[PDB]
Amino acid sequence: DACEQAAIQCVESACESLCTEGEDRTGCYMYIYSNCPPYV
């Protein structure tokens, strides 16, 4: 969905607007932290 794809694009602002509150926002942030610059 758009949430998943916005994580993969590394745009953390979009976690809030495109992901459901709770685990899907957490998962968006954790993906970014795991695999986006400057975390990697």
CSV table of N, CA, C and O in Angstrom, one decimal:
chain,number,residue,atom,x,y,z
A,1,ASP,N,0.9,-1.2,0.0
A,1,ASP,CA,0.0,0.0,0.0
A,1,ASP,C,0.9,1.2,0.0
A,1,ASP,O,2.2,1.1,-0.1
A,2,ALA,N,0.3,2.4,0.1
A,2,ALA,CA,1.1,3.6,0.0
A,2,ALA,C,2.1,3.8,1.2
A,2,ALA,O,3.1,4.3,1.1
A,3,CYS,N,1.6,3.3,2.4
A,3,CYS,CA,2.4,3.3,3.6
A,3,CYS,C,3.7,2.5,3.3
A,3,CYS,O,4.8,3.0,3.6
A,4,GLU,N,3.6,1.3,2.9
A,4,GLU,CA,4.8,0.4,2.7
A,4,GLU,C,5.7,1.1,1.7
A,4,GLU,O,6.9,1.1,1.8
A,5,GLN,N,5.1,1.6,0.6
A,5,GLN,CA,5.9,2.2,-0.5
A,5,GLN,C,6.5,3.5,0.0
A,5,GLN,O,7.7,3.8,-0.4
A,6,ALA,N,6.0,4.3,0.8
A,6,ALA,CA,6.5,5.5,1.3
A,6,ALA,C,7.7,5.2,2.3
A,6,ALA,O,8.7,5.9,2.3
A,7,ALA,N,7.6,4.1,3.2
A,7,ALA,CA,8.8,3.6,3.9
A,7,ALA,C,9.9,3.3,3.0
A,7,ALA,O,11.1,3.7,3.2
A,8,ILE,N,9.6,2.6,1.9
A,8,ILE,CA,10.7,2.1,1.0
A,8,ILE,C,11.3,3.3,0.2
A,8,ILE,O,12.5,3.3,-0.1
A,9,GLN,N,10.5,4.4,0.1
A,9,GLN,CA,11.1,5.6,-0.5
A,9,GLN,C,11.9,6.5,0.5
A,9,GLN,O,12.6,7.4,0.1
A,10,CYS,N,11.9,6.1,1.8
A,10,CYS,CA,12.6,6.8,2.8
A,10,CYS,C,12.1,8.2,3.1
A,10,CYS,O,12.9,9.1,3.3
A,11,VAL,N,10.8,8.3,3.2
A,11,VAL,CA,10.1,9.6,3.4
A,11,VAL,C,9.3,9.4,4.7
A,11,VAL,O,8.2,9.1,4.7
A,12,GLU,N,10.0,9.7,5.8
A,12,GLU,CA,9.4,9.5,7.1
A,12,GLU,C,8.1,10.3,7.4
A,12,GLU,O,7.2,9.9,8.0
A,13,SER,N,8.1,11.5,6.8
A,13,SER,CA,6.8,12.3,7.0
A,13,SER,C,5.6,11.6,6.5
A,13,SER,O,4.5,11.8,7.1
A,14,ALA,N,5.8,10.8,5.5
A,14,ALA,CA,4.6,10.1,5.0
A,14,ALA,C,4.2,8.9,5.8
A,14,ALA,O,3.1,8.4,5.5
A,15,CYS,N,5.1,8.5,6.8
A,15,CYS,CA,4.6,7.4,7.6
A,15,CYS,C,3.3,7.8,8.3
A,15,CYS,O,2.3,7.1,8.4
A,16,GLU,N,3.2,9.1,8.8
A,16,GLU,CA,2.1,9.5,9.6
A,16,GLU,C,0.8,9.6,8.7
A,16,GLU,O,-0.2,9.2,9.2
A,17,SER,N,1.0,10.1,7.5
A,17,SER,CA,-0.2,10.4,6.8
A,17,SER,C,-0.7,9.2,6.0
A,17,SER,O,-1.8,9.1,5.7
A,18,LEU,N,0.2,8.2,5.7
A,18,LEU,CA,-0.2,7.1,4.9
A,18,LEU,C,-0.4,5.8,5.6
A,18,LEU,O,-1.0,4.8,5.1
A,19,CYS,N,0.1,5.7,6.8
A,19,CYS,CA,0.0,4.5,7.6
A,19,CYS,C,-1.0,4.6,8.7
A,19,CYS,O,-1.1,5.7,9.3
A,20,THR,N,-1.6,3.5,9.1
A,20,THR,CA,-2.5,3.4,10.2
A,20,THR,C,-1.8,3.6,11.5
A,20,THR,O,-0.6,3.1,11.6
A,21,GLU,N,-2.4,4.2,12.5
A,21,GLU,CA,-1.8,4.4,13.8
A,21,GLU,C,-1.5,2.9,14.4
A,21,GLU,O,-2.2,2.0,14.1
A,22,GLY,N,-0.5,2.8,15.2
A,22,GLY,CA,-0.1,1.6,15.8
A,22,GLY,C,1.0,0.9,15.0
A,22,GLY,O,2.0,1.6,14.6
A,23,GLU,N,0.9,-0.4,14.8
A,23,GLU,CA,2.0,-1.1,14.3
A,23,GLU,C,2.4,-0.6,12.9
A,23,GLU,O,3.6,-0.7,12.6
A,24,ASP,N,1.5,-0.2,12.1
A,24,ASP,CA,2.0,0.1,10.7
A,24,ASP,C,2.8,1.4,10.7
A,24,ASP,O,3.8,1.4,10.0
A,25,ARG,N,2.6,2.3,11.6
A,25,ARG,CA,3.5,3.5,11.7
A,25,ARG,C,4.8,3.1,12.3
A,25,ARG,O,5.8,3.6,11.9
A,26,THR,N,4.8,2.2,13.3
A,26,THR,CA,6.0,1.7,13.9
A,26,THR,C,6.8,1.0,12.8
A,26,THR,O,8.0,1.2,12.7
A,27,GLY,N,6.2,0.2,12.0
A,27,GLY,CA,6.9,-0.6,11.0
A,27,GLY,C,7.5,0.3,9.9
A,27,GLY,O,8.6,0.0,9.4
A,28,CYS,N,6.8,1.4,9.6
A,28,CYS,CA,7.3,2.4,8.6
A,28,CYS,C,8.6,3.0,9.1
A,28,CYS,O,9.6,3.0,8.4
A,29,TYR,N,8.6,3.5,10.4
A,29,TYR,CA,9.8,4.0,11.0
A,29,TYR,C,10.9,3.0,11.1
A,29,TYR,O,12.0,3.3,10.8
A,30,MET,N,10.6,1.8,11.5
A,30,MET,CA,11.6,0.8,11.7
A,30,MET,C,12.2,0.4,10.4
A,30,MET,O,13.4,0.2,10.3
A,31,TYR,N,11.5,0.4,9.3
A,31,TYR,CA,12.0,0.1,8.0
A,31,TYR,C,13.1,1.2,7.6
A,31,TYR,O,14.2,0.9,7.2
A,32,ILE,N,12.6,2.5,7.8
A,32,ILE,CA,13.5,3.6,7.4
A,32,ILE,C,14.8,3.5,8.2
A,32,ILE,O,15.9,3.6,7.7
A,33,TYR,N,14.7,3.2,9.5
A,33,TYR,CA,15.8,3.1,10.4
A,33,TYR,C,16.7,1.9,9.9
A,33,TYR,O,18.0,1.9,10.1
A,34,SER,N,16.1,0.9,9.4
A,34,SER,CA,16.9,-0.2,9.1
A,34,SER,C,17.7,-0.1,7.7
A,34,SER,O,18.6,-0.8,7.6
A,35,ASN,N,17.2,0.7,6.8
A,35,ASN,CA,17.6,0.5,5.5
A,35,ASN,C,17.7,1.8,4.6
A,35,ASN,O,17.9,1.7,3.4
A,36,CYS,N,17.5,3.0,5.2
A,36,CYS,CA,17.5,4.2,4.5
A,36,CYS,C,18.7,5.0,5.0
A,36,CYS,O,19.0,5.0,6.1
A,37,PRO,N,19.3,5.8,4.0
A,37,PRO,CA,20.3,6.8,4.4
A,37,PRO,C,19.7,7.8,5.4
A,37,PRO,O,18.5,8.1,5.2
A,38,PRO,N,20.4,8.3,6.5
A,38,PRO,CA,21.7,8.0,6.9
A,38,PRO,C,21.8,7.0,7.9
A,38,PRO,O,22.9,6.8,8.4
A,39,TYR,N,20.8,6.1,8.0
A,39,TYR,CA,20.9,5.0,9.0
A,39,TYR,C,21.8,3.9,8.5
A,39,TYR,O,22.4,3.1,9.2
A,40,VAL,N,21.9,3.8,7.1
A,40,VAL,CA,22.8,3.0,6.5
A,40,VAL,C,23.5,3.8,5.5
A,40,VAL,O,23.1,4.9,5.1
